[PDB]
Ligand binder design. Structure first.
Ligand SMILES: Nc1nc2c(ncn2[C@@H]2O[C@H](COP(=O)(O)OP(=O)(O)O)[C@@H](O)[C@H]2O)c(=O)[nH]1
Ligand SMILES: [Mg+2]
Length: 169
């Protein structure tokens, strides 16, 4: 059976969680995707010559009960922690998402990547140094992305898979 990597995209409303997932899946930028919709996506990819499947939950932070949400948070192998480089509050919110992950996983060693999205925008209020400093503090990679231009999108998901492989070895 083809190895599957169960991945979970988390972060504040409006950082580009849906746009990043749809760019990876459909290879286009969606300007408009209902902020309250949480759905999973499955995509076959080749990472360093290994054919594998990514099983991705795009989270929406809604209150309504979802058996699927609970399952992915509990059994997810890797987390993308997304903020927007032009949204200081979304960067300030990252510590909350990391705490939620450690608690549901009951582990201090969960594979994670810090994702700074919307790097196409000039109005940057979160600099590369402060993002690299937070990622260093957590012992995780930092990747700059644009869902709009596709800059760093494969790099973000593929780096998370490389972190999961390391954790499995
Ligand atoms: N300029 C730019 N806009 C983005 C990017 N990613 C998402 N957006 C826009 O930011 C808004 C929120 O995106 P969305 O994917 O709904 O965020 P979510 O709430 O995290 O799922 C939408 O208007 C998107 O079109 C990006 O990389 N660059
Ligand atoms: Mg969304």
């Amino acid at each position: 059976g083809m190895t599957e990597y169960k991945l979970v995209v988390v972060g504040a409303d409006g950082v580009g969680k849906s746009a990043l997932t749809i760019q990876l899946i459909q290879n286009h930028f969606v300007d408009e995707y209902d902020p309250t919709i949480e759905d999973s996506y499955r995509k076959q990819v080749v990472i360093d010559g290994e054919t594998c499947l990514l099983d991705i939950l795009d989270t929406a932070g809604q209150e309504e009960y979802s058996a699927m949400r609970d399952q992915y948070m509990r059994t997810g192998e890797g987390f993308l922690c997304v903020f927007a480089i032009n949204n200081t509050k979304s960067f300030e919110d990252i510590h909350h998402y990391r705490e939620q992950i450690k608690r549901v996983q009951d582990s201090e060693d969960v594979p994670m990547v810090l994702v700074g999205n919307k790097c196409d925008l000039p109005s940057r209020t979160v600099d590369t140094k402060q993002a690299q400093d937070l990622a260093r503090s957590y012992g995780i990679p930092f990747i700059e992305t644009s869902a709009k231009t596709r800059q760093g999108v494969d790099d973000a998901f593929y780096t998370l898979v490389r972190e999961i492989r390391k954790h499995k070895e």
